[PDB]
Design a protein around this ligand. Structure first.
Ligand code: OGA
Ligand code: ZN
Lengths: 16, 328
């Protein structure tokens, strides 16, 4: 739950 | 004794105060302390892209291959990027920058033309380094200081290097304030870029677009004309600032806001960055949370509601309903 909400994406610059 | 590399008159003028990012030797413990603690630092002697310091448009045209390069065009000095996939759910959004694929030599001829015809148009090459590049570039790339940067990757528990972005811009070009979800060693190669960073705890002051908007991760605030009625806390923003030139590496920690400009009347700028995925979430969570962990939370709430509601256009209304007269 906390881990679920703490996970991040890896989006950079233009799109991702 | 070559004189001042650049002066204040080449820097654009803004409404907020800054303090300087520290410039340090890669061997200086303070520089390691800052990186470990996810604060910016300009390293002056990594030799990270030593071999690339001879790069200029002629050497690159001759050597970088026949591959395609993404070149962004803008009618203004600000190059706001937009995620094309997200255009759908904000029908009232028209871009302020087109992207065009072209061969490298076409890009150089484009600059020549604009220059020769006194054009107003601005260009920004931004292309991931890849297989297609010529033998000499491959050799220059292999000559990067991998020993040093690999060690940094091991010490910070980072994930993999996802890419190296090659950036070639015209003097005066601005990348507006935004944050990236990876760690970045930003390796300046030719010319000078002014970098203004803001910590993740100033989220409140910088007013990012909605996650589902094409400009996700950029500030909505026009730095050249801040609308203090819509963005009142922009009056409280304080930046960390530096000017990086050839040989400098700027550590831009994950989630740190950064505004980046090529110095006015400073010629073309060239940069190669190094994007690494961040360390995994820790086994045990320490409270209270760090700011970037809160940004992570907020992004996920926005994502989940967009999905759960079946439509991101309903995220705003639901969120407002949740708070008005209840948490505000
Ligand atoms: O160099 C620029 O103009 C923009 N680059 C970035 O935002 C980056 O490297 O993450
Ligand atoms: Zn960035």
């Amino acid at each position: 739950v906390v881990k679920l909400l703490l996970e991040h994406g890896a989006d950079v610059x233009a799109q991702d | 004794a070559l004189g001042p590399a650049w002066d204040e008159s080449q820097l654009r003028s803004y409404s907020f105060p800054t303090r300087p990012i520290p410039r340090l030797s890669q061997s200086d413990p303070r520089a390691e302390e800052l990186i470990e603690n996810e604060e910016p630092v300009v390293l002056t002697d990594t030799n990270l892209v030593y071999p690339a310091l001879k790069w200029d448009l002629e050497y690159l045209q001759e050597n970088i291959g026949n591959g395609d390069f993404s070149v962004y065009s803008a009618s203004t000095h600000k190059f706001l990027y937009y995620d094309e996939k997200k255009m759908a759910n904000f029908q009232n959004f028209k871009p302020r920058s087109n992207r065009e694929e072209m061969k490298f030599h076409e890009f150089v001829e484009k600059l020549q033309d604009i220059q020769q015809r006194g054009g107003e148009e601005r260009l920004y090459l931004q292309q991931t380094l890849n297989d297609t590049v010529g033998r000499k570039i491959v050799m220059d790339f292999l000559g990067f200081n991998w020993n040093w940067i690999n060690k940094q990757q091991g010490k910070r528990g980072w994930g993999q290097l996802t890419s190296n972005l090659l950036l070639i811009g015209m003097e005066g070009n601005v990348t507006p304030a935004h944050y990236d979800e990876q760690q970045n060693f930003f390796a300046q190669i030719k010319g000078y870029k002014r970098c203004i960073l803001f910590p993740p705890d100033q989220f409140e002051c910088l007013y990012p677009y909605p996650v589902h908007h094409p400009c996700d991760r950029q500030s909505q605030v026009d730095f050249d004309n801040p609308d203090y009625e819509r963005f009142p806390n922009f009056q409280n923003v304080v930046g960390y600032e530096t000017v990086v030139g050839p040989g400098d590496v700027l550590y831009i920690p994950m989630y740190w806001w950064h505004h980046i400009e090529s110095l006015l009347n400073g010629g073309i700028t060239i940069t190669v960055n190094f994007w690494y995925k961040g360390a995994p979430t820790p086994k045990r969570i320490e409270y209270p949370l760090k700011a970037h962990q809160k940004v992570a939370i907020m992004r996920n709430i926005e994502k989940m509601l967009g999905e759960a509601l079946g439509n991101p256009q309903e995220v705003g209304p639901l969120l407002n309903t949740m708070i008005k007269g209840r948490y505000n």
